[PDB]
Design a protein around this ligand. Sequence first.
Ligand SMILES: N=C(N)c1ccc(CNC(=O)[C@@H]2CCCN2C(=O)CNC2CCCCC2)cc1
Ligand SMILES: [Ca+2]
Length: 223
Amino acid sequence: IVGGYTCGANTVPYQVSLNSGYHFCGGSLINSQWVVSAAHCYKSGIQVRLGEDNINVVEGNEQFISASKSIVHPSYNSNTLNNDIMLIKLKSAASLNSRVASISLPTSCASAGTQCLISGWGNTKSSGTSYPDVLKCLKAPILSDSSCKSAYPGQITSNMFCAGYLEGGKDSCQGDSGGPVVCSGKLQGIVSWGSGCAQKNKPGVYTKVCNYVSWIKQTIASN
Ligand SMILES: N=C(N)c1ccc(CNC(=O)[C@@H]2CCCN2C(=O)CNC2CCCCC2)cc1
Ligand SMILES: [Ca+2]
């Protein structure tokens, strides 16, 4: 997160860190046994870390649970990042509490101008690299269709939206991938891609979760 702020410990209780001996992606807890992340975050050997603030210190409140299943959308395209969504089933259910909590799926898509909360342990610099220990947050609005497509012509599918700031300075970034975009208490986006980070006229691009609510429920119900 570039241009954001320290969230505060466990203020984003649905935020998870995906770990492979290091933090490599974010995710969102949507019930005690399932996480939503980016298909481009797929790999073997995923450990889900819930309840985290400082990812480099065992502080209390952490739950480390191995992934049992990682289900990449069958129509994911690694070139266009269309359908950049993955469901991870935990080997055991998490213990839900004030610091480890699920986030609701949307009942409808969000509209342009809606303010949302984006969070993660990704890069905090727009030119170079600095990775934080504690969770970072950013308030960011959803952009209009036309503005999104003007920023990224021929690259925005119906399964993507733009959010952020055309003036630069405030954005998600590498390491935030798979993490939440939450708007009015609903999980509307997944950190997916962009051109650079926090660059002028190049806002972030997010997986449009409202298009996958039925896929998610059907897939979880059958697994
Ligand atoms: N909101 C941002 N600006 C942002 C950007 C990137 C990421 C992480 N996602 C990624 O890195 C995804 C994986 C496949 C390649 N990809 C990219 O985003 C491609 N980024 C380049 C495209 C051409 C212009 C230079 C930058 C997360 C957020
Ligand atoms: Ca910790």
